[PDB]
Amino acid sequence: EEFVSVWVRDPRIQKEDFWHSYIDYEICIHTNSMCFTMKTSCVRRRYREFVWLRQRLQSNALLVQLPELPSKNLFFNMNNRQHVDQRRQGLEDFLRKVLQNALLLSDSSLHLFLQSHLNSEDIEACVSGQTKYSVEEAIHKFALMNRRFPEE
Amino acid sequence: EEFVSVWVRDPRIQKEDFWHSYIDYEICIHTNSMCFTMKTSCVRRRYREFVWLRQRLQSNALLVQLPELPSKNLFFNMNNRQHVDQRRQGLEDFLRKVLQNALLLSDSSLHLFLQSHLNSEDIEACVSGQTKYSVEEAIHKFALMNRRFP
Numbered sequence: 001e002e003f004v005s006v007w008v009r010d011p012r013i014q015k016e017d018f019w020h021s022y023i024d025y026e027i028c029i030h031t032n033s034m035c036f037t038m039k040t041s042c043v044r045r046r047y048r049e050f051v052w053l054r055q056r057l058q059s060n061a062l063l064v065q066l067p068e069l070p071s072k073n074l075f076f077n078m079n080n081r082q083h084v085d086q087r088r089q090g091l092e093d094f095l096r097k098v099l100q101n102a103l104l105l106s107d108s109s110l111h112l113f114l115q116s117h118l119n120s121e122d123i124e125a126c127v128s129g130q131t132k133y134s135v136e137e138a139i140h141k142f143a144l145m146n147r148r149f150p151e152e
Numbered sequence: 153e154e155f156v157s158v159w160v161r162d163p164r165i166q167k168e169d170f171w172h173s174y175i176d177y178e179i180c181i182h183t184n185s186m187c188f189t190m191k192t193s194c195v196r197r198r199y200r201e202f203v204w205l206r207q208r209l210q211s212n213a214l215l216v217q218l219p220e221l222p223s224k225n226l227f228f229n230m231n232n233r234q235h236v237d238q239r240r241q242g243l244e245d246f247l248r249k250v251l252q253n254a255l256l257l258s259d260s261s262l263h264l265f266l267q268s269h270l271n272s273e274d275i276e277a278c279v280s281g282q283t284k285y286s287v288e289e290a291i292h293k294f295a296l297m298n299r300r301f302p
Contacts, residue, residue: 149194
């Protein structure tokens with residue numbers, strides 16, 4: 001019987017030796033549902049991308065009540081363990097709830113967010129019909145790159 | 153439209169401690185079909201397991217002619233680059249033909265052979281209903297273990 005499971009884990013600093021470092025997380029999906037292209041996926045995303053995601057979803061579903069995100073960057077300090085953990089929990093809760101909703105499950109944005117390398121610009125390009133590649137193509141190409149699959 | 157692609161590659165010698173040696177191969181599937189559980193898979197199998205597979209398939213589809221397997225087995229010398237290559241080619245051709253056939257595509261044995269770690273004893277157990285886990289379970293657990301998922 002159909003299930004979908006999601007973990008957010010493994011916080012890591014990025015561009016650490018630059019100005020403009022940021023923290024991102026790993027998002028792992030495991031499902032047996034027809035809804036997803038891949039039954040498993042791990043992808044890395046940061047809070048600002050979750051924000052984009054939330055608002056993208058909100059604007060295609062005016063009547064839907066999106067779940068909360070955890071606290072904003074302004075109130076986030078990576079040296080406070082409790083911060084980084086609260087953020088990860090919150091981002092898990094957010095996705096868990098989102099994924100319980102079939103209308104949202106039907107948004108290619110969410111799928112590309114979860115099962116592709118594409119950033120928000122390209123996601124928007126892709127679901128709006130303006131890229132050479134389809135949504136399925138992008139997802140498959142991510143799995144091949146990501147699983148170091150040989151051949152083609 | 154739906155596609156399915158298979159490669160057999162990366163022959164390797166397997167040296168269990170003893171005077172025990174064999175070659176196995178990597179079998180990689182890439183598909184976008186609803187027929188398969190996973191859209192990608194890489195698993196390692198050996199010639200003898202193919203032999204098992206072919207007889208198992210033959211016996212659940214008694215009206216289908218199965219493509220042949222490569223036939224030079226006694227002769228075969230795993231230190232002859234060309235022997236091992238001629239094999240892997242044959243095993244690719246075997247699977248490619250097999251997969252073009254929808255009756256065979258609906259045999260769980262094939263799926264477990266391609267998308268799980270289970271060996272033949274367990275495959276048989278599993279498709280017979282004698283294991284605690286289902287077929288879908290075994291395939292999903294393989295992908296999780298294999299993709300180092302938490």
